[PDB]
Write a protein that binds this DNA or RNA. Structure first.
Lengths: 125, 50, 58, 113, 257, 80, 58
RNA sequence: AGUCUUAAACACACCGCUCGUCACGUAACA
RNA sequence: AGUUCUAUUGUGUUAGCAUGGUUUCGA
RNA sequence: UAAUACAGGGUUGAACUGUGGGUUAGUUUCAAUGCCCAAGGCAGAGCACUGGAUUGGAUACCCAGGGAACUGUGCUCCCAUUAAUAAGAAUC
RNA sequence: UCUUUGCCUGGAGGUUCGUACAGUUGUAGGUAAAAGGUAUGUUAGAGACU
RNA sequence: UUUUUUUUUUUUUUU
RNA sequence: AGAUCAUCGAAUAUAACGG
RNA sequence: UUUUUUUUUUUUUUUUUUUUUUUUUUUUUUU
RNA sequence: GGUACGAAGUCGAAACAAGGUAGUUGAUGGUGAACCAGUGGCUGAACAAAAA
């Protein structure tokens, strides 16, 4: 779980093209969801470290703000009816860790199952 | 495969010990008093018995 | 095989020199390499000189 | 392990004394489970500065001697103290025998080339 | 007013201290650097004396002991990283430093190094206990080391916690435990035959009995101590002690030195 | 110790050589320090300060040499 | 070289410019700070001349 | 005498700034 | 990371020695 | 801080091992100077102390004498408290 | 970006094994600015030169 | 006379 | 019938059972 | 008080490692 | 004994900047008041300061 929070520092760079990241089982699954939304150009497992590319548009990067909700020292859980109040009138991306794999916040409400808020992408206050 | 490395280790140490014996042999040869005292010792041994 | 590096933390502490007019070391001496130092190849790119000895077996 | 000792005699030292001195030393060697290696001589040596030793006088030169031996490491202290009490010996030192650098196996082609 | 001074040394403490050094100075009839007779045959009789252990130094003498002990617990030739070999190697290193501290007492820098090795050896036993239980008991018997099991977390109380210093209780009889001197367990002042009054900061080191934390035969009964009686195994006197290195109530572990 | 012999040279010229000899060995600096007792704390800071000023002096001394050398020769280097 | 018996650990920029060899500002680390450029706004400082400001355009 | 460099607890800027013993008066922990 | 072996040692302890400022002596 | 004895740490080569760890009390060593006690002495230095200077009205600044303090297996950590103002992991 | 230990809340103040052990910042008579610092000016029996 | 101080004194040597 | 943070008064800690 | 000579006693940091040379590799927005 | 506030008199020139001939600090000694002498540590340290 500790290695998951170490990906925000590397992926949050302006003047860079590719950054390394420690190899982890959970980290690989997270990158898949981000690529679908069009946030990561691509990634490759280089053995002990994973090389992840950075996407840019008109100079500025596609990622501008990263918020870590879940931490190794504690665990944030929200009911299906409570996640909607938290996440409303926004374009942000919340990573939800449900029993049936990992999915975004939009899919969590559709199934109505209780997920787990891991991190936030392109989120304001 | 571990047993294969066991034979290699024995050969490696064997060569190292071989070079050590050569150094000690030099000392013996180079030593004069060692030989002189040794030589004398032997002579007396036979004279006493005879 | 895949193996990850180990923690750089080690036992002991940093070098300390005793105070007062009696100059003496407490734990470690000047010849102490920290665990976060760079590789020796980069620190001494010149390497042994032509007039250097090729056998340090003193 | 092996050991080396360099003893610098004086002008007032005859061949009689040298034999006696070495015989005494051998006693200690044997005591501690040891054996003598070899004994050699270096002849006379010129001194850079005058040597003023108390109750001995003043000397400008002496006879340099060298002898190798081997005994227990604890025998170095006993040997060192014996030399100092004995007359004639004005200066001495004990040097451990090394593998490569030695006066036995390495004595040729030093100054030449 | 009493003066704080060091306590006198007990008569038995001095006698045991000298005996320990005598054992460490013993020189058996053997050879160093694995100088088997095969190579020694090429040397002269005179020269062979020098190579004997009697003519060897402390470094060579200490190294020889490690080889003999390693072979006793050697799984395969040229293998020293196994926990069984490491357990014996560390034991010899601790005694080597302890003997040096007796002759040299002004070397305060090495005092901290000894603690590192003592703690390091303790962690080795914990790992070996969970991976192999049968082997953990066999190694203790050969080395006469107090076997201790790790099945429950250790309590925070010092009167019943573990003590890495007293691990080798069988081999060391003067580093088992001592008395408390913190607030109420302090010693009372006394007057020597000197026309003066002094006080000891530390209590005297008494000689403990041989039955320190050992099983004993119990008697069946029904009282406060045994609300449900006494088990059958307890009566025979064969139960296994989980923490044999416990100092017990009203006692403290011995100091590091 | 230093010894010099006068041979076909004026006393003033010879005396100028021995005077500079002490500067290399710091004869004057050591003579005055031993006269007065200096506290150990002062030497702790003085020894460190001398390790930053003296190195800087050597670099500036070389720069002055180029100015004098180039003045008598004119010319100037550029990004050619 | 001389054998120092200790070391100085200053904290103020006043004496730090004397004991240390130099106090020149090195290039900022790209991994912590951005690269400086001439396009940044200038500092807000008023013009002064011997204590008398000059804020006239003739 | 006019500038340059450095230091500063002052900027009604050295006729600056600031501390201590003793004398008198009003009070809370007595 | 740790154990063994090998090369390396102005790091801890250590009684006699050599040299030297000061001091002391005058067949 | 040349020689010698005991035992540590760091760099490189081979073998072995195959997750052994980060922080750390109801815990344990060491720790400049000063003071009590003790051991001490015949050198180089000096607090207190009548021993030769003060003032434009008061003094320890400048010489000299001077019985405390200066080597401890001890009692013992008050400080401007001993190699920066973080003990670890990730981005070069 | 993440794990764990320790510590502080403007400045400021206190009666006139038993004389031992343990333990301590806090219950006021009073106050509204203590203070880090970039720059300018001024002073300097503090360094240099027309 | 020597020593010392910005200057001076105290102190020490006696053909 | 099961589970079900304690807080203030500054603080001062090891106690009760059997040989 | 100066110079010279020949052996008493206490004490032990003057000489001997260095242009701080890794992507310079790190110290805190503003005046 | 010691401390707070208001007013304000006498006796002194300690801090500032090398004038008090550097100045705060740990433990002692001493002095009508600035505090002063010695040892340890620090800079929150002023002046001066290398070629053959």
């Amino acid at each position: 779980m500790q290695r998951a929070c170490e990906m925000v520092v590397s992926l949050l760079r302006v003047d860079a093209l590719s950054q390394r990241c420690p190899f982890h089982v959970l980290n690989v699954q997270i990158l898949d969801l981000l690529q679908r939304e069009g946030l990561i150009r691509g990634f490759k497992v280089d053995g002990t470290k994973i090389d992840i590319l950075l996407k840019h548009y008109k100079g500025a990067p596609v990622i501008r703000n990263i918020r870590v909700v879940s931490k190794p020292s504690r665990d944030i859980w929200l009911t299906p009816h409570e996640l909607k109040f938290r996440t409303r009138f926004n374009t942000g991306l919340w990573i939800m860790q449900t029993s049936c794999g990992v999915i975004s916040h939009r899919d969590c409400l559709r199934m109505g199952i209780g997920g787990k808020m891991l991190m936030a992408i392109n989120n304001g206050y | 495969e571990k047993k294969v490395t066991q034979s290699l280790q024995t050969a490696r140490v064997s060569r190292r010990k071989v070079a050590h014996v050569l150094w000690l042999k030099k000392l013996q040869d180079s030593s004069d008093f060692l030989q002189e005292q040794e030589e004398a010792a032997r002579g007396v041994a036979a004279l006493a018995r005879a | 095989p895949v193996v990850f590096p180990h923690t750089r933390a080690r036992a002991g502490g940093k070098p300390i020199m005793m105070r007062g007019k009696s100059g003496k070391w407490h734990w470690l001496g000047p010849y102490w390499k920290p665990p976060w130092a760079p590789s020796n190849k980069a620190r001494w790119p010149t390497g042994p000189e032509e007039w250097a000895w090729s056998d340090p077996t003193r | 392990v092996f050991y080396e000792t360099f003893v610098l005699f004086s002008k007032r030292v005859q061949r009689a004394d040298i034999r006696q001195l070495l015989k005494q030393q051998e006693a200690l060697i044997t005591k501690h489970h040891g054996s003598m290696l070899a004994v050699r001589d270096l002849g006379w040596r010129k001194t850079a500065f005058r040597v003023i030793k108390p109750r001995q006088g003043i000397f400008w030169f002496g006879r340099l001697f060298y002898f190798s031996f081997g005994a227990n490491p604890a025998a170095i202290t006993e040997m060192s103290q014996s030399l100092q009490s004995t007359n004639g010996v004005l200066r001495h030192a004990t040097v451990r025998m090394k593998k490569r650098h030695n006066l036995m196996t390495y004595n040729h082609h030093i100054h030449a080339r | 007013v009493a003066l704080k001074t060091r306590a006198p040394k007990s008569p038995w403490y001095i006698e045991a201290e000298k005996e320990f050094l005598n054992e460490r100075a013993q020189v058996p009839d053997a050879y160093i650097e694995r100088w088997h007779g095969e190579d020694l045959s090429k040397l002269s009789p005179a020269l062979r004396r020098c190579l004997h252990l009697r003519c060897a130094s402390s470094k060579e003498l200490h190294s020889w002991r490690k080889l003999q002990l390693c072979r006793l617990l050697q799984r395969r030739p040229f293998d020293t990283g196994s926990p069984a070999v490491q357990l014996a190697c560390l034991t010899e290193k601790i005694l080597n430093v302890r003997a040096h501290l007796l002759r040299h007492f002004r070397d305060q820098q090495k005092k901290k190094v000894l603690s590192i090795w003592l703690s390091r050896r303790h962690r080795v036993m914990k790992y070996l206990y969970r991976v192999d239980f049968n082997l953990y008991k066999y190694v203790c018997q050969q080395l006469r080391i107090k076997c201790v099991r790790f099945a429950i977390p250790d309590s925070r109380d010092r009167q019943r916690a573990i003590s890495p210093i007293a691990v080798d209780g069988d081999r060391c009889k003067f580093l088992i435990r001592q008395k408390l001197w913190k607030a109420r367990f302090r010693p009372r002042q006394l007057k020597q035959v000197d026309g003066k009054v002094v006080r000891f900061t530390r209590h005297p080191m008494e000689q403990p009995s041989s039955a320190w934390n050992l099983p004993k035969e119990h008697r069946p009964s029904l009282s406060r101590a045994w609300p449900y009686g006494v088990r059958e195994e307890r009566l025979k006197g064969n139960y296994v002690i989980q923490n044999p290195t416990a100092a017990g109530l009203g006692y403290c572990p011995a100091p590091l030195f | 110790s230093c010894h010099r012999h006068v041979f076909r040279a004026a006393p003033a010229a010879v005396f100028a050589s021995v005077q500079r000899w002490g500067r290399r060995n710091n004869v004057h600096k050591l003579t005055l320090l031993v006269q007065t007792y200096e506290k150990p704390c002062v030497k702790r800071t003085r020894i460190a300060e001398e390790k930053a000023y003296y190195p800087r002096w050597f670099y500036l001394r070389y720069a002055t040499e180029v100015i004098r050398y180039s003045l008598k020769h004119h010319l100037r280097l550029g990004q050619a | 070289a001389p054998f120092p018996r200790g070391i100085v650990k200053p904290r103020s920029a006043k004496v730090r410019a004397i004991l240390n060899l130099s106090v020149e500002q090195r290039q900022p680390n790209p991994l912590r700070a951005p690269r400086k450029s001439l396009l940044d706004p200038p500092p807000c400082v008023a013009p002064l001349e011997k204590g008398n400001p000059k804020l006239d355009r003739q």
